[PDB]
Amino acid sequence: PQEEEMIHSILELEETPVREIMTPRVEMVAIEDEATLEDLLALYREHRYSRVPVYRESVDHIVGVAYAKDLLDYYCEEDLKGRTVASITHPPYFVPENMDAWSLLKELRRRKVHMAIVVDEFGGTAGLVTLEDVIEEIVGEI
Amino acid sequence: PQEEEMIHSILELEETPVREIMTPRVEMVAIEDEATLEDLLALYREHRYSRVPVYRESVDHIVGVAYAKDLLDYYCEEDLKGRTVASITHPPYFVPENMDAWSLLKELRRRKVHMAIVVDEFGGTAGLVTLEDVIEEIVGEI
Ligand SMILES: Nc1ncnc2c1ncn2[C@@H]1O[C@H](COP(=O)(O)OP(=O)(O)OP(=O)(O)O)[C@@H](O)[C@H]1O
Ligand SMILES: Nc1ncnc2c1ncn2[C@@H]1O[C@H](COP(=O)(O)OP(=O)(O)OP(=O)(O)O)[C@@H](O)[C@H]1O
Ligand SMILES: [Mg+2]
Ligand SMILES: [Mg+2]
Ligand SMILES: [Mg+2]
Ligand SMILES: [Mg+2]
């Protein structure tokens, strides 16, 4: 039926490069590690992404990922200008640009992380890829 | 390989009742529609769920779902005591207790919703079920 197309999508996950499914660098919404949490709130309000990569000087040097929801732990009274994105930043999980989607889903589940940073052949940033991107190859588009 | 177990999990999704995969009512974290957004912030801080069902008088009368992230649109200056959970509540998607997981994933994708409210045979609430619960039948546990 339509069960059939998902069967083929699973056997083909070991043959799909993560570069074929990622969100490329020029479409990433990211933030500097020295930005305040108030700037993360503003960034969230504009773009509505739950997970934001964090970089030092360029989007080509990701140093981690920040969750917009972690802002909810902080009191507007003083904390938001008083802390930087680095204070809430989780360590990044990098995957090569030619890693297959099958291996990525295995490691995303094991590592208990939802977003991976995809690096290019030369040491910079090619983009990001999330569990939803991997899911949409199996299921369709969400 | 291990590709094999996911093949069986997909053909069996049409034979798995949503009651077999849901989170049951007594383990739901929910909030009253007349609670302030400050109480939703407190509820989020304690339990960390992103989506919370919303009820009138009992958890057996769900009237919608609230997103913790929608609190980030509101200014601590006055809004949080000044609004109620009802002001941010999205309409609920109810599914019967014997609906198959296959049909649920089809409708969750089409409807562009992540959480469904599972109703019991007698008109009350049996629990909730999310796209992740459906995903974990295919993939494992996340
Ligand atoms: N920071 C980001 N910048 C640009 N694109 C992103 C970012 N985060 C995710 N995406 C892309 O948006 C799509 C949706 O991803 P995902 O649902 O994981 O993010 P989200 O909707 O912010 O998270 P969640 O659904 O858990 O709230 C994916 O294709 C992903 O590649
Ligand atoms: N409000 C809730 N109360 C109790 N259990 C819930 C609630 N929301 C989700 N769950 C359960 O927790 C598990 C994780 O679900 P899910 O990842 O969709 O929620 P979440 O982690 O809060 O959302 P997100 O990952 O998008 O931030 C699922 O098994 C789901 O049934
Ligand atoms: Mg998508
Ligand atoms: Mg989404
Ligand atoms: Mg889970
Ligand atoms: Mg989760």
Side-chain angles (χ1 to χ4, degrees), chain B residues 26-37 39-45 47-49:
Chain B
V26 290
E27 293 177 325
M28 290 172 67
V29 172
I31 190 147
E32 283 168 355
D33 63 333
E34 270 161 49
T36 70
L37 296 185
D39 309 313
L40 183 67
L41 190 72
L43 186 78
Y44 174 78
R45 276 184 197 150
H47 295 89
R48 303 321 191 91
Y49 287 108

Side-chain angles (χ1 to χ4, degrees), chain A residues 18-19 21-37 39-45 47-56 58-68 70-76 79-80 82:
Chain A
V18 76
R19 71 161 73 80
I21 64 166
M22 62 174 178
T23 285
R25 166 193 68 260
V26 290
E27 293 177 325
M28 290 172 67
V29 172
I31 190 147
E32 283 168 355
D33 63 333
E34 270 161 49
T36 70
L37 296 185
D39 309 313
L40 183 67
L41 190 72
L43 186 78
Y44 174 78
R45 276 184 197 150
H47 295 89
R48 303 321 191 91
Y49 287 108
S50 296
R51 290 184 199 62
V52 174
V54 181
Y55 68 90
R56 284 264 153 69
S58 172
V59 59
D60 271 300
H61 176 29
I62 301 299
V63 297
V65 183
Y67 307 156
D70 287 348
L71 294 177
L72 290 175
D73 289 303
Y74 289 100
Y75 295 67
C76 300
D79 305 355
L80 283 196

Side-chain angles (χ1 to χ4, degrees), chain B residues 12 15-19 21-37 39-45 47-56 58-68 70-74:
Chain B
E12 191 72 1
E15 308 154 57
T16 312
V18 76
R19 71 161 73 80
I21 64 166
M22 62 174 178
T23 285
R25 166 193 68 260
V26 290
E27 293 177 325
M28 290 172 67
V29 172
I31 190 147
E32 283 168 355
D33 63 333
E34 270 161 49
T36 70
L37 296 185
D39 309 313
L40 183 67
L41 190 72
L43 186 78
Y44 174 78
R45 276 184 197 150
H47 295 89
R48 303 321 191 91
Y49 287 108
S50 296
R51 290 184 199 62
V52 174
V54 181
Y55 68 90
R56 284 264 153 69
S58 172
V59 59
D60 271 300
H61 176 29
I62 301 299
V63 297
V65 183
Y67 307 156
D70 287 348
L71 294 177
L72 290 175
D73 289 303
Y74 289 100

